[PDB]
A paper describes a structure:
To decipher the molecular interactions between [name] and [name], we solved the crystal structure of the [name]·[name] complex from [name] (Vc) together with ADP and Mg2+, forming a heterotetramer composed of the canonical [name] dimer and two molecules of [name]. The asymmetric unit of the crystal contains two molecules of [name] and two molecules of [name]. The crystal structure of the [name]·[name] complex revealed domain swapping between symmetry-related molecules of [name]. The NTD and CTD (N-terminal and C-terminal domains) of two [name] molecules connected by an extended hinge region (residues Glu99–Ser121) are exchanged between neighboring molecules related by a true crystallographic twofold rotation axis. Therefore, formation of the complex with [name] does not alter the overall canonical architecture of the [name] dimer or the NTP binding site. Interestingly, the CTD tail of [name], which was observed to be disordered in solution by SAXS, folds into a small helix hairpin in contact with [name], again in agreement with our previous molecular-dynamics analyses.
Numbering used by the authors:
A (entry chain D): 104 to 157
B (entry chain A): 10 to 459
C (entry chain B): 13 to 459
D (entry chain C): 104 to 155
E (entry chain B): 238 to 356
């Protein structure tokens, strides 16, 4: 009831990472310095394929 | 027996030094003036062992800071004007310094060696001073000598704390940004990334109490400021393995514990004070005590007039025992003291605020500091507290990462329809939105509920 | 030879006298071992003979055996250590040279302090040796080594005498406090009785260690209220009441007290127009006050917090404590070191009085004036902000009480003869208001 | 004045300790460290009742 | 002020220097990402980024990295001398600066004038 009475915008968190994001992260990693490249590849590795709707 | 002391005096009286590295730094700057910005970040004039090199380096510093080209002639003329050229070995020695180091790009490595030697030289000097103080205390007790030793050693460590921080290029910031995001994604982020506040509505806005944050909780008297901060401590103590450290500058440890017992057990605070506890009240208090003893994750320091240095020292001591701290609470910022700034209260409070923020970053722990709202607010009494009400008491806003105000309409208006409700106003937030959270204030239990 | 020897101090810090007093003291009492063993260890002694003797003392007392000169001598003789310590004569000398008891704990602290400095000097030499000969350690490793060795010295002296910080210590003190409250009659009052039932219901009496600020506008009965608290403490407690009357003389305070306790018109006392009944009441009251002799009045002007503390300690020593300390007007006190800032001066006085309350475990009542800005508003009851403008005394006060009289502002008020006591701040109880009957003619507040 | 002083419920405080409290204090003393155990046993000893 | 910095960084070859005395460098970058990519700032904070949001952020990052014409100094309580010193250091590397942004003037300090805030 407190949530419904003081609702500052619907807080619906949807965080599954897309394969598209992993692809762009790897594309940036090609232009990044070795230190940034490792972090971008690590983030792209963390990106799981949660594709749906079809 | 006569040949033993001469070799020992020669080997013991010479402190660590590197004349070769000193010459290479000076010679290197004479070859490439543009390297001064990097070298000046690592070494100071006093870092040089040799008196002639200190005078020469002082000349180099003065010329380059003035934007003048540093060459053998310019440096020689500079030293000649001050009648110091003969003291350094003449023009020939300056020429020799430029000749003996024909290699560039290694000047930074030589600067680090000179700085390292200076550090060991200062350490030996401090050790001798402490030894002298130990042999001749001159009226100082053991506690004073221990504090003196800790202060001098801490000063050596502090000088070498943030030495190479100048260059801050985007590639480095991107790497640290991605590392931070990666760490957040690895940890369970069900709406809380830091220390749990125990209030869902508050966590939704703040994502918990973040590490390295200086949090200012400000309220008028009797608004439940101590009560609110203690509920944050109780939640951190019950949900984290790391300890909670409380600097209660106003109240004794017994009083803080009694209020905590009233809160966690939901037993009337007056009943605890009066001793009129029923069988049910005793059972709840006892169960709460059993849990607190099982956890043992809370420290209470009730020493008065603590300096930021003392607060930092005690915090580090406890953090070392557990590999970190969950939360640091400082009861009233204004009650702390800075002996060096007694002439100005505003500057004294500003320094305390800066020191606590530095402490939060140093130990990677949220630091909650309680503050009082300015008396001018009562003259207005028409609206909610604002950041300007705190600026009048030491400009603490500039250093705070999060500012939370406590407002109770029932205190000003006893016939308010919001009886038993306290509004938590987010006046400032670096990593989240500003706004307000309504909490149930239960004065009888010294507790805030969601 | 002597000039170099005089300049060089190869003798580390020590106190043979304190060591002898610890040993001699234990031979005299035995029961003090539990306290001494918390402060000193065998290795804390500088002298080799004293370490062997103390080791013998430790072994005998831990075994529950009586420690005497003969038993200790036999113990040392069995181990062929009696000759190493100086013989039976030296043991007898140790027992003879310290005829004083109750100071053994102080000597134990001195021995421990000397041992601490001795260990510190040893560590300083080790660090100096490491600095001269790093043996393959870099500067960072040497700094970590120095920090580790110094931290080890500090850790040994962390939590020596109960160490208040850890939960085990707080639990023990909590239970001790509960036990003390349960032993004393707790019929709604755990501290010094205020004499007002409604006020005691909210405050549970005037607690020990509390700094109480009583603030009011002029003629609201501020001195009257504080004095009734003093009168009640003087009549109900065996310990003395100490009054620092910075504004009024002792004769005037006594005359007002006579008017209050005897319920005789204050004007009649002043004018001397006392009837037979008035004289009988005053005389009876005086007889009781003289029988009790539990009140001190200091009418010295411009007292410093140090002077106030000094006089309070003097009186407390005579009676084993104080029931209540009343300081007439906080603003009338002076701090010679803070003459350049009145706000800071008042803040320091407030901090000093709170420290005094904790030091002597006595409630300290300090009277304060409300800021003049309140009269410009004159629309509501006094609040904490009215006192903040006069020295930030709110931060140090454990209890803040305001006196409000509607009849002063509104002569046609239906609350004529009623004074409202507002609890503006309370650490160990609720905030609110208490209505008291104000009898100006008698300089008295009634429930 | 008597009405005004004792209006919100009769305030008759009766705080003598119960045998129940002494029993719970001793039950806690069994799990407490030696220092706390002695204080809990001392408090339980102070608890008077002697019913039946 | 940051939009002025973003425009200077995208249109000039010389670097932009930012002295963020109040906010950390990570926060300034996140706000910049929200701005240049036109992605909801709350979404960036919460991590609820859709495929389109990730593509825009990634493209923006690629450009920022290609340009490398921005420096962020998040040191607190900097003196005018320190600000001048760091600015000169960077300017020497590129033959000049495009823009210098100092986040809050009031957050800076002058040890010689502690007795008077106005001065
Ligand atoms: N026995 C009690 N019953 C009800 N409320 C109480 C009791 N004791 C204290 N309180 C309430 O608890 C709060 C204590 O406020 P506190 O945090 O100590 O002050 P500050 O805001 O100056 O730090 C007040 O709102 C007070 O009314
Ligand atoms: N003879 C008298 N008859 C009636 N009321 C008196 C008499 N003398 C003093 N009073 C009252 O006693 C009170 C004295 O106030 P006091 O405590 O001395 O001042 P303050 O609040 O500044 O400390 C006032 O309310 C005054 O009206
Ligand atoms: Mg508090
Ligand atoms: Mg007076």
């Amino acid at each position: 009831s407190k949530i419904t009475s003081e609702d500052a915008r619907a807080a619906n968190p949807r965080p599954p990472l897309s394969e598209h994001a992993a692809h762009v992260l790897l594309a940036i990693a090609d232009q990044a310095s070795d230190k940034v490249k490792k972090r971008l590849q690590s983030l792209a590795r963390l990106a799981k394929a949660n594709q749906k709707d079809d | 027996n006569r040949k033993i002391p001469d070799a020992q005096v020669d080997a013991i009286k010479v402190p660590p030094h590197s004349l070769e590295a000193e010459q290479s730094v000076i010679g290197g700057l004479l070859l490439d003036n543009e390297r001064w910005d990097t070298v000046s970040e690592h070494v100071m004039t006093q870092d040089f062992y040799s008196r002639p090199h200190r005078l020469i380096f002082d000349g180099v510093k003065s010329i380059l800071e003035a934007g003048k080209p540093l060459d053998l002639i310019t440096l020689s003329e500079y030293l000649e004007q001050r009648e110091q050229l003969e003291d350094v070995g003449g023009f020939a020695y300056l020429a020799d310094l430029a000749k003996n180091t024909p290699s560039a790009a290694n000047i930074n490595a030589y600067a680090e060696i000179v700085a390292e030697r200076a550090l060991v030289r200062n350490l030996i000097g401090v050790a001798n001073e402490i030894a002298d103080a130990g042999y001749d205390p001159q009226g100082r007790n053991a506690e004073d000598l221990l504090d003196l030793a800790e202060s001098k050693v801490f000063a050596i460590a502090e000088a070498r704390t943030s030495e190479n921080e100048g260059p801050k290029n985007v590639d480095s910031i991107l790497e640290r940004t991605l590392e931070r995001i990666e760490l957040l994604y690895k940890t369970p982020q069900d709406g809380v990334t830091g220390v749990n506040t125990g209030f869902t509505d508050l966590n939704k806005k703040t994502a918990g109490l973040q590490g390295s944050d200086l949090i200012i909780v400000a309220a008028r008297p009797s608004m439940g400021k101590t009560t609110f901060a203690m509920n944050l401590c109780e939640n951190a103590a019950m949900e984290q393995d790391k300890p909670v450290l409380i600097f209660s500058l106003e109240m004794p440890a017994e009083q803080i514990m009694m209020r905590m017992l009233a809160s966690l057990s939901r037993v009337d605070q007056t009943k605890i004070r009066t001793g009129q506890l029923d069988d049910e009240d005793w059972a709840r208090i006892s169960s709460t005590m059993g849990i607190l003893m099982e956890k043992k994750n809370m420290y209470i320091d009730d020493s008065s007039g603590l300096t930021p240095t003392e607060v930092r020292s005690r915090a580090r001591r406890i953090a070392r025992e557990h590999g970190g701290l969950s939360l640091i609470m400082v009861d009233y910022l204004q009650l702390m003291r800075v002996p060096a700034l007694t002439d100005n209260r505003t500057l004294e409070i500003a320094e305390i605020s800066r020191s606590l923020k530095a402490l939060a970053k140093e130990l990677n722990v949220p630091v909650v500091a309680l503050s009082q709202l300015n008396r001018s607010l009562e003259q207005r009494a028409d609206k909610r507290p604002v950041n300007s009400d705190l600026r009048e008491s030491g400009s603490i806003e500039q250093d705070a990462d999060l500012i939370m105000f406590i407002y109770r309409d029932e205190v000003y208006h006893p016939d308010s329809p919001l009886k038993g409700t306290a509004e938590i106003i987010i006046g400032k937030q670096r990593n989240g939105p500003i706004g307000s959270v309504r909490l149930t204030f239960q004065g009888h239990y010294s507790r805030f509920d969601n």
